[PDB]
Ligand binder design. Structure first.
Ligand SMILES: CN(C)CCCS(=O)(=O)N1CCN(c2ccc(Br)c(NC(=O)c3coc(N)n3)c2)CC1
Ligand SMILES: CN(C)CCCS(=O)(=O)N1CCN(c2ccc(Br)c(NC(=O)c3coc(N)n3)c2)CC1
Ligand SMILES: CN(C)CCCS(=O)(=O)N1CCN(c2ccc(Br)c(NC(=O)c3coc(N)n3)c2)CC1
Ligand SMILES: Nc1c(C(=O)N[C@@H](CC(=O)O)C(=O)O)ncn1[C@@H]1O[C@H](COP(=O)(O)O)[C@@H](O)[C@H]1O
Ligand SMILES: Nc1c(C(=O)N[C@@H](CC(=O)O)C(=O)O)ncn1[C@@H]1O[C@H](COP(=O)(O)O)[C@@H](O)[C@H]1O
Ligand SMILES: Nc1c(C(=O)N[C@@H](CC(=O)O)C(=O)O)ncn1[C@@H]1O[C@H](COP(=O)(O)O)[C@@H](O)[C@H]1O
Lengths: 419, 419, 419
């Protein structure tokens, strides 16, 4: 591994140029912990490895959800390879529960106040002035330029929405450990290669506030260090065990907590092209999806036997019924299974106006729903698994973000058609 | 507790009439354990209390799902009150994994063969002829009678179908304990009061096969007693600990393992009647359901803020969007939430044919589904929570059964209009 | 007729290879009769000729209905040519009336109990273990192989369903002779050439139970031989006369007992392509089908005169009215004939949604039905002649089966796209 020159040395991490790989970069964590611009610089054994481990688990989690992130891979216990970024010197803060600074900047508001939606706040990176809060108006007006991307209305709006989505995803991801994610800081930079704005720096035990069972007294984050009346050698052991607790538990944010399956039933082999598209779309959400051929009209006894195969192996399953014309497959399925059924009929414009009403009007005692879009029927099935699988949810949540960013970009481009 | 005469003394339980309650009955468990028509019978301390405890939790669970079951309330440590039944002398068996007698009567079938759907079998009650298997043809031909109900085509079909649902519900209910329900036996009787066929006798540690982590060697049911080459005092201790293990865990089957919530959003207060039908229907499935008033057209900033309130407290949530005319509320909800959205528009015959296409045709990036029935929209919301909540699932599964039974009876009634 | 080596010698027939025909086979009947694994075996003059004769008429009939059956052509008095099969060692039994072993294995069931649908049972082939009944579970678990086809879920389900259709066809086919088919046994094999599962072995007077006027005491099948407390020379004469009686009547099952005709009326010669599809489809069911050109709008006096021509020669007739636009031809036909009328308008996606209501809404006094599919209109015409012509019925019944088999295979194929 071909180390280059030191591009930045921070209190807890160094960034190197990678001579062997053009426009990539190595972030080395150090065995260092700190509190503000105070005198807490304190060497801590194994901290480097814990910090690197967390940012790698989080960045991979966020990346596999579809958040645009500056991360390629881990490089040993204490560093990682990422595309080179020109950092935007703004600390972006998201908070579900008012605490810390929000109390001092909003006297009257009590510890525990809930923000719906999660609150976003901007802080300019200055220690000489102790990180002062900025309005979106201040950042737009500062006309900052980084790797030749001017930070204007569109880029600030995008980072703001992204901070919220990133927080929501990490919050959702920690929930199955009965851990309340209270708040967090992230930094965005510009990928010098692509010129995309991407999550950068790190996200580790310094970056957030983590309360098991929502109990502040069991705080596992760096707050435990910042709170110590006086830092003793014995006092740093508690702090380290808190860090160890997280590092051992973060690897389970990447673990699926629920099995998900779609079963597409098609009435005819000539529907296969339509069903391929559903399988593909389920693919994009990381949901196993099986195709099967059965007719309620010509083989209803097997429609029930096939139903039973997937009903009875204990795996949580959504059925998607693909039948054109008189869709008798959706009704029979809906009426004889406790698991959800989505009719997704392969309507063409010729008889689509007439055949949709075979899917929509069923005698009650049937909860059969309708979704025309084949990618839609996957996405809906995902939304359903999203209630019980944080990985599926995170993919859906990020999808919303990126679809919104996509419109912001399209609008900026075509806005120039008016100048 | 005014005890009457003794109506039945079995090997492990007695049935008494209650002088002070007409057509009710006390089932007393005994401290007794048995296997076959051999001399394998044993006193066992605490067994009476354990057996009664289980039948009480299982019957409450089956009853709260909506299975017609002969159970009033537990009556101390070791008995329970039930409506009087004339017992039908058939042991109904349902299996999900071939073992035991299925292998002896089907040489060639390997221990572990999975039944899809679950296999149902009849055995006629006789310690004399060693409990011989019977066919539906044999039970129909028997022309049996109980509390004036002739057991014909319709009643046998009903008990057969019922055995499958009761198995499925108890199988699903044990799943969150890592416990594979392998098989079970239940007995049905006729409630002398109603003339309904109802689950009766008991369901306890004698009645089923229970494998923790699907491992036969960890079997916690009576099989562990049946299997002893010799019954020793140390051997009966293992058996008792097995029973104790179950009795500790049986209560947890009644406990909801996940939070469920529907949020109905309505555009106008004049939709409230429609929304109340959905709230009631959610009630029927035991899902908490909130109404809110918000318009996409007139107050979209609020629609999103309200959305955020339910998204942010981490309770799994189905949104149901009630908007007539140009449903703009379902789209805007669907496009800005990871959680499922069901449009349930209050369509009338006048403009319903035209307004439904505002719900059905959406741009991609949206997983909005459509369900016209207001009862249906709750049922669909149930199906969704059914994947991750065994109590909701049990209510859906039972509902299917009873709706099937209801058709079977009505067909019998109107079949007399053919004479 | 170049005989080869002897591939099998059974109790009543031998199978030879044919040296001059690759993958074909000669089945030779013998002048032999047998019952059980006892010493009941007897020479019987003319039996070979009678048995061969029946299997030939039955197989031709089943084959002409569209059942996949191993039969090429009769080869003299006492043999027939068939494709080579690896026989599957299961006797498949179908019953319409409980008798014989069904009563011995189901004590309590009275001789005469009717099965709806007809009952199917498996028996594994062994004179050793006295032909023991097997369950579908046992045959699947056997992992049997024949001509490289593994007998699994799909193949067992196919043979099971097939046994029912083959029974139904032969039951319906004997009905016009006042003969109740009580039950039957068939064997299936794998055609070594095609790898298809096909009806094989034989179906003769040994294979079924035949009761003239539903009277067991007039039984004409082998049962009359099985039942003899003692076999005497005078006793074998009765048995032989029973066999002769069947062999005289078996040919008449191939004979159409009623005349069938479809008359397609078309308004315009430019509809002819549509009308040809109906004519072909009538062909497929062996129903003679005539085209005629007549307009209700432009030549109603002729429409009636043509109608009169088919009404007057006393051949049972379905009219199929092909008129696009303002179907006036179906109404005027329907209103002026006792014979059924099916409107089959050549609707296109452009104006089909609007023109269908000229076919559907008629004043009372008219029994005009509507069938959009041109294939379907022939099929419906078949269903109608199916009530009064056993050959047409057999083709409809078989069609159902093969369409079911076709789904079963295609599901198996596409099920591999799940691995
Ligand atoms: C005016 N311009 C063109 C001159 C460039 C100055 S520099 O090349 O030397 N520059 C490199 C990036 N630096 C930097 C400084 C501090 C940090 Br942190 C990071 N972080 C990342 O690069 C990163 C990428 O991905 C992730 N997760 N982090 C980068 C800061 C110094
Ligand atoms: C004289 N004729 C009309 C017959 C009367 C004899 S009896 O009526 O007195 N007698 C028999 C045993 N029976 C019996 C025998 C054995 C049993 Br177990 C049960 N179980 C139940 O009744 C029951 C209902 O609900 C529940 N959970 N159990 C009943 C029911 C009572
Ligand atoms: C060496 N291996 C691959 C086995 C070969 C032994 S064999 O192939 O020579 N042999 C066995 C008996 N078989 C057999 C044995 C008994 C019978 Br019956 C039938 N019947 C039919 O083949 C058949 C097909 O169609 C009809 N109507 N019959 C076949 C088929 C031939
Ligand atoms: N971790 C940091 C930092 C930060 O720079 N922290 C270090 C400073 C350093 O690393 O040099 C410190 O605590 O002294 N700033 C914000 N946050 C996080 O942001 C949210 C805001 O909290 P608030 O500042 O309002 O209390 C909470 O999660 C912080 O931990
Ligand atoms: N508990 C019983 C009984 C049964 O009668 N048990 C006791 C009677 C008593 O003491 O109350 C006995 O005599 O062993 N019969 C079937 N089953 C259950 O049925 C399923 C089928 O197993 P199989 O019929 O294969 O043995 C498995 O769950 C058995 O435990
Ligand atoms: N013909 C046969 C056979 C059978 O193997 N017959 C012969 C064998 C031979 O000589 O070729 C015998 O050994 O009796 N087995 C069943 N069936 C028919 O099956 C239905 C069922 O009757 P059940 O199985 O109740 O006896 C009824 O039609 C029998 O004739």
């Amino acid at each position: 591994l071909n180390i280059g020159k030191k591009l930045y040395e921070g209190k807890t991490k160094e960034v190197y140029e990678l001579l062997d790989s053009p426009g990539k970069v190595l972030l080395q964590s150090k065995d260092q912990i700190t509190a503000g611009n105070a005198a807490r610089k304190n060497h801590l054994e194994g901290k480097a490895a814990i910090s690197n481990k967390i940012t790698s688990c989080i960045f991979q989690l966020l990346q596999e959800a579809g958040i645009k992130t500056a991360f390629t891979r881990k490089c040993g216990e204490t560093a990682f390879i990422a595309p080179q970024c020109e950092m935007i010197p703004i600390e972006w803060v998201c908070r579900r529960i008012a605490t810390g600074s929000f109390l001092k900047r909003n006297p009257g508001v009590k510890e525990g106040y809930k923000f719906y939606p999660p609150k976003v706040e901007l802080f300019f990176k200055d220690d000489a002035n102790n990180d002062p809060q900025w309005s979106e108006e201040q950042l737009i007006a500062a006309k900052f330029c980084f790797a030749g991307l001017l930070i204007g209305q569109t880029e600030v709006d995008i980072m703001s929405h992204a901070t919220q989505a990133i927080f929501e995803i990490l919050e959702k991801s920690w929930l199955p450990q009965n851990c309340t994610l209270v708040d967090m800081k992230i930094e965005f930079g510009v990928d010098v290669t692509t010129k995309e704005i991407v999550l950068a720096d790190v996200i580790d035990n310094d970056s957030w506030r983590l309360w098991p069972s929502g109990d502040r007294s069991q705080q596992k984050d760096k707050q435990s260090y910042r709170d110590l009346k006086e830092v003793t050698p014995e006092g740093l052991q508690m702090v380290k065990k808190n860090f160890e607790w997280v590092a051992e538990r973060v690897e389970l944010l990447l673990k699926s907590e629920s099995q998900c399956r779609v079963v597409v039933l098609m009435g005819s082999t000539s529907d296969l092209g339509h069903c391929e598209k559903i399988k593909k779309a389920c693919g994009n959400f990381g949901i196993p999806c099986e195709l099967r051929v059965t007719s309620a009209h010509k083989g209803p006894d097997e429609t029930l036997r096939i139903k039973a195969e997937y009903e009875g192996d204990g795996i949580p399953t959504v059925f998607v019924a693909v039948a054109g014309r008189s869709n008798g497959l959706g009704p029979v399925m809906s009426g004889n299974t406790a698991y959800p059924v989505i009719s997704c009929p392969p309507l063409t414009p010729d008889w689509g106006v007439q055949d949709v009403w075979s899917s929509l009007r069923l005698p009650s005692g049937l909860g059969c729903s309708t979704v025309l879009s084949p990618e839609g029927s996957a996405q809906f099935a995902a939304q359903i698994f999203g209630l019980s699988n944080h990985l599926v949810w995170s993919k859906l949540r990020a999808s919303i973000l990126n679809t919104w960013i996509s419109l912001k970009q399209a609008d900026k481009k075509i806005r120039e058609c008016n100048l």
